[PDB]
Design an enzyme around this catalytic site. Structure first.
Site, mmCIF file in Angstrom:
data_model
loop_
_atom_site.group_PDB
_atom_site.id
_atom_site.type_symbol
_atom_site.label_atom_id
_atom_site.label_comp_id
_atom_site.label_asym_id
_atom_site.label_seq_id
_atom_site.Cartn_x
_atom_site.Cartn_y
_atom_site.Cartn_z
ATOM 1 N N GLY A 31 -3.579 81.506 95.828
ATOM 2 C CA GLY A 31 -2.343 80.935 96.275
ATOM 3 C C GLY A 31 -1.822 79.834 95.380
ATOM 4 N N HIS A 47 -4.179 80.621 105.638
ATOM 5 C CA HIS A 47 -5.567 80.441 105.297
ATOM 6 C C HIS A 47 -5.652 79.300 104.283
ATOM 7 C CE1 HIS A 47 -9.458 81.629 103.320
ATOM 8 N NE2 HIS A 47 -9.811 81.571 104.592
ATOM 9 N N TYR A 51 -7.679 75.783 104.886
ATOM 10 C CA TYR A 51 -8.628 75.146 103.997
ATOM 11 C C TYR A 51 -8.124 73.777 103.581
ATOM 12 C CZ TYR A 51 -11.647 79.270 103.067
ATOM 13 O OH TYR A 51 -12.583 80.323 103.084
ATOM 14 N N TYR A 64 -21.581 79.627 106.505
ATOM 15 C CA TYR A 64 -21.598 79.482 107.944
ATOM 16 C C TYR A 64 -22.196 80.777 108.508
ATOM 17 C CZ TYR A 64 -17.397 82.267 107.087
ATOM 18 O OH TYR A 64 -16.487 83.211 106.637
HETATM 19 C C1 LIG Z 1 -12.668 85.977 95.331
HETATM 20 O O1 LIG Z 1 -12.356 86.776 96.479
HETATM 21 C C2 LIG Z 1 -11.323 86.496 97.352
HETATM 22 C C3 LIG Z 1 -11.069 87.377 98.398
HETATM 23 C C4 LIG Z 1 -10.040 87.137 99.305
HETATM 24 C C5 LIG Z 1 -9.246 86.003 99.173
HETATM 25 C C6 LIG Z 1 -8.127 85.726 100.139
HETATM 26 O O2 LIG Z 1 -7.901 86.585 101.116
HETATM 27 O O3 LIG Z 1 -7.419 84.731 100.038
HETATM 28 C C7 LIG Z 1 -9.499 85.117 98.137
HETATM 29 C C8 LIG Z 1 -10.526 85.359 97.225
#
Ligand SMILES: COc1ccc(C(=O)O)cc1
Length: 121
Positions: A31, A47, A51, A64
């Site tokens: 992102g 997400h 975080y 976890y």
């Molecule tokens: C390195 O692997 C990933 C897998 C999924 C995601 C995500 O869904 O944001 C990020 C990194």
């Protein structure tokens, strides 16, 4: 941790986190900016914000524990950071499942330059 999140994603969706969600849209797997491309990308936006609510946690590496009650994910008690990380991942995995119906391969390996502008959490 990232590997656990990836396992959770696969369990939930039947897609491999890499490459299905590691480079999807503007926020999945890396992102940063732009208007999320679709509902799946919005899962990753939230997400990322989730975080971001945990600056003193380390979601990439901290592990976890969780179990399945029925098909439902139940985060088991660990440290505070682990619990909160697990809840973020759980939400995202469920979100990905909820939005599989609109997942589009054209957003895989989405080029950075088509993601511009900040969107507040
Ligand atoms: C390195 O692997 C990933 C897998 C999924 C995601 C995500 O869904 O944001 C990020 C990194």
């Amino acid at each position: 941790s990232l590997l656990e999140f990836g396992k959770m994603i696969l369990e939930e969706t039947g897609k491999l986190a890499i490459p299905s969600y590691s480079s999807y849209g503007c926020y999945c797997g890396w992102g940063g900016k732009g208007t999320p491309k679709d509902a799946t990308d919005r899962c990753c936006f939230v997400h990322d914000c989730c975080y971001g609510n945990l600056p003193d946690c380390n979601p990439k590496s901290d592990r976890y524990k969780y179990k399945r009650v029925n098909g439902a994910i139940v985060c088991e008690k660990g440290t505070s950071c682990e619990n909160r990380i697990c809840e973020c991942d759980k939400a995202a995995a469920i979100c990905f499942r909820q939005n599989l119906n609109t997942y589009s391969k054209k957003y895989m390996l989405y080029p950075d330059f088509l993601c511009k502008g900040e969107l507040k959490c």
